[PDB]
Amino acid sequence: AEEEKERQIASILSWEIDIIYKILLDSDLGSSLPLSQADFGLWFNHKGRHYFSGIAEVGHISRLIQDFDGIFNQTMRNTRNLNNRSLRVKFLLQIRNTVSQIITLLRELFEEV
Amino acid sequence: AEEEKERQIASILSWEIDIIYKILLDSDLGSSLPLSQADFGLWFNHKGRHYFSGIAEVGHISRLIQDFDGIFNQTMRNTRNLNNRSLRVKFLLQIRNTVSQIITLLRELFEEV
């Protein structure tokens, strides 16, 4: 219960850092996966939604994941951007904001049930 | 047990993300703290070492934390370096390696007991 919560929080944090270092070191996404295809995204869609069925914050996390998928795919269609500092920073700001909100809502979901 | 393992991992990852963004955005450490003074570093010194007393991996974690204090001060005495890409990348790798190694050892400690 509480074990599963911390595990998922560490999971999404691990995914974010992996992508951040890919961007900072290599100026590219490369083998990175969108959140929906990452460890956390698969847990949330396949297991998380059903365990948290009928709780409002679930729809909010799904939206955040979905919104980032779009941002992620757009950049995937343009790694010319990640060499550019401004476009690099923009993306880096977007991932941090997405993960931050999700963790807080995820905390809320686990406490609620 | 497994819960505590994941919680501390989430804690050090949180610190790592914060300092990375401080570096990326402001090109200086500024209000950043070395790991030893963040939540995890304080937890390890006050609670972690004693709970895992006499186990070799503890001395290794203390070593990594102590070493980063020195790395932190050297970089702090030369924030001109964080403007230089190579020296910035050098520091970011020092951070990733310090955190990665500590996490691996922290896992080792928790599985053993």
Side-chain angles (χ1 to χ4, degrees):
Chain A
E2 193 76 6
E3 170 184 335
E4 191 65 29
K5 176 193 165 186
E6 300 292 338
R7 175 177 299 150
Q8 297 307 327
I9 291 175
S11 181
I12 194 174
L13 287 179
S14 299
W15 166 85
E16 177 180 15
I17 284 166
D18 287 8
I19 287 193
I20 287 170
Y21 274 102
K22 271 294 303 167
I23 298 166
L24 287 183
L25 286 185
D26 294 337
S27 298
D28 164 52
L29 292 183
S31 59
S32 299
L33 289 176
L35 185 54
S36 64
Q37 305 307 311
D39 319 335
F40 170 77
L42 296 178
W43 171 85
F44 185 78
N45 286 329
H46 297 338
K47 178 179 161 191
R49 299 183 312 187
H50 301 131
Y51 188 79
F52 297 135
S53 182
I55 310 167
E57 284 73 20
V58 175
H60 195 178
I61 290 178
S62 299
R63 187 174 312 113
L64 292 174
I65 294 174
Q66 198 173 6
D67 287 335
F68 183 80
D69 279 1
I71 291 174
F72 186 92
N73 288 327
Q74 291 177 331
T75 307
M76 182 62 70
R77 294 196 298 272
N78 214 334
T79 55
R80 178 63 175 175
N81 297 7
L82 291 182
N83 301 280
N84 183 281
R85 177 194 163 81
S86 290
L87 298 174
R88 179 194 304 147
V89 171
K90 166 189 168 59
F91 188 74
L92 284 166
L93 290 182
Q94 280 166 329
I95 189 171
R96 189 177 59 165
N97 293 328
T98 299
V99 174
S100 295
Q101 295 168 74
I102 288 180
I103 290 179
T104 54
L105 296 162
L106 198 71
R107 288 198 184 276
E108 195 164 357
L109 287 178
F110 272 103
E111 325 307 294
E112 283 182 68
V113 68
Chain B
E2 287 284 328
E3 171 183 336
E4 191 64 27
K5 177 193 69 174
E6 302 292 340
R7 175 179 299 150
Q8 296 306 326
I9 289 174
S11 181
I12 191 175
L13 289 180
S14 172
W15 166 84
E16 182 181 18
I17 290 165
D18 287 8
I19 54 165
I20 287 169
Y21 273 81
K22 273 296 303 167
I23 297 166
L24 158 78
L25 280 60
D26 295 337
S27 298
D28 84 313
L29 293 183
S31 59
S32 299
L33 290 175
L35 182 55
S36 64
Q37 305 306 310
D39 310 334
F40 169 77
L42 295 179
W43 171 86
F44 182 78
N45 286 328
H46 297 158
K47 179 178 161 191
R49 299 182 312 187
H50 303 131
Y51 190 79
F52 296 132
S53 182
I55 308 168
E57 284 73 20
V58 174
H60 194 178
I61 289 178
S62 299
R63 187 175 314 114
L64 293 175
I65 292 175
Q66 195 174 6
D67 288 336
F68 187 81
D69 277 0
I71 293 174
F72 187 93
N73 286 325
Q74 292 178 331
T75 309
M76 182 63 71
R77 294 196 299 272
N78 212 335
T79 56
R80 182 64 175 176
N81 296 6
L82 292 183
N83 302 279
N84 183 282
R85 177 194 163 81
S86 290
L87 298 174
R88 179 191 303 149
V89 171
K90 167 188 168 59
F91 187 69
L92 284 166
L93 291 183
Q94 279 167 329
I95 291 163
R96 187 174 58 164
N97 294 329
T98 299
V99 173
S100 295
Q101 296 164 238
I102 288 180
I103 288 178
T104 56
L105 295 161
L106 198 70
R107 285 198 179 106
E108 193 62 47
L109 287 176
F110 274 105
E111 312 300 295
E112 283 181 340
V113 67

